[PDB]
Design a protein around this ligand. Structure first.
Ligand SMILES: [Hg+2]
Ligand SMILES: [Zn+2]
Length: 256
């Protein structure tokens, strides 16, 4: 099916998912000199104290750390957002080398990776209903650069040996996503879409300005993952990122 290679990569996705060429597609380039400080943006609230992780899954495209979202335990509100958005999962996109991997770019600059923390508008009852809505989803994007290790990422790094191939899952409880946040919550925001099929245009994007740094050895373990399922030829899970899409008639706002 859809993937990241020459023959099923993002340049092909439009054939199964015509909205690929839609009016509010993600990711985009963040032109810092075109983005406008928005004084009407309320402060951003990230409440991950009571977050309940359940498991980690390799879905043949990335890995998802999944959360119990049957209660308001880890929530996003404030900033551009109306009401409450509930954390369902996080995942990353990364490159084969450090000079690429992010989905969003800043002044055309690509980071080594990007973390996405995916939240759904509790107004819509469940994730499935929210992805039928222009304001159903809120994704918090955080860039990764290679430098010093990120201590609160290592529990993730160490579990990856056990979910090497498509469809493998491991138990993954008591993971604290607060360990992945940078010091600053400064951000850019714009209306967009999922960056993976079915590319639904339901997302308010909140991209933090301040990246987190991870070690070369942390990003390397990411790169030992497999796109393929157990017992198949080895395709390293790398370059699982969609490139910047046309901005069209959209405005990126700054919180700062
Ligand atoms: Hg939508
Ligand atoms: Zn993503």
């Amino acid at each position: 099916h859809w993937g990241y290679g020459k023959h099923n990569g993002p340049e092909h996705w439009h054939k199964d998912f015509p909205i690929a060429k839609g009016e509010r597609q993600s990711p985009v380039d963040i032109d810092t000199h075109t983005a406008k400080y928005d004084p009407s943006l309320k402060p951003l609230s990230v409440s991950y104290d009571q977050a309940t992780s359940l498991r980690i899954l390799n879905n043949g495209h990335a890995f998802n750390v999944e959360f119990d979202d049957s209660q308001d335990k880890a929530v996003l509100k404030g900033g551009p957002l109306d009401g409450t958005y509930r954390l369902i999962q996080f995942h990353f996109h990364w490159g084969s080398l450090d000079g690429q991997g992010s989905e969003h770019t800043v002044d055309k600059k690509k980071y080594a990776a990007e973390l996405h923390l995916v939240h759904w508008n509790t107004k819509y009852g469940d994730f499935g209903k929210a992805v039928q809505q222009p304001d159903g989803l809120a994704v918090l994007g955080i860039f990764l650069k290679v430098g010093s290790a990120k201590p609160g990422l290592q529990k993730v790094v160490d579990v990856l040996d056990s979910i090497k191939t498509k469809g493998k899952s491991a138990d993954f409880t008591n993971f604290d996503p607060r360990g992945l946040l940078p010091e600053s919550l400064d951000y850019w925001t714009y209306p967009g879409s999922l960056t993976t099929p079915p590319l639904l245009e339901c997302v308010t994007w909140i991209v933090l300005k301040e990246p987190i740094s991870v070690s070369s050895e942390q990003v390397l373990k990411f790169r030992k993952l497999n796109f393929n399922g157990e017992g198949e030829p080895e395709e390293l899970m790398v370059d699982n990122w969609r490139p910047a899409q046309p901005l069209k008639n959209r405005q990126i706002k700054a919180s700062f």
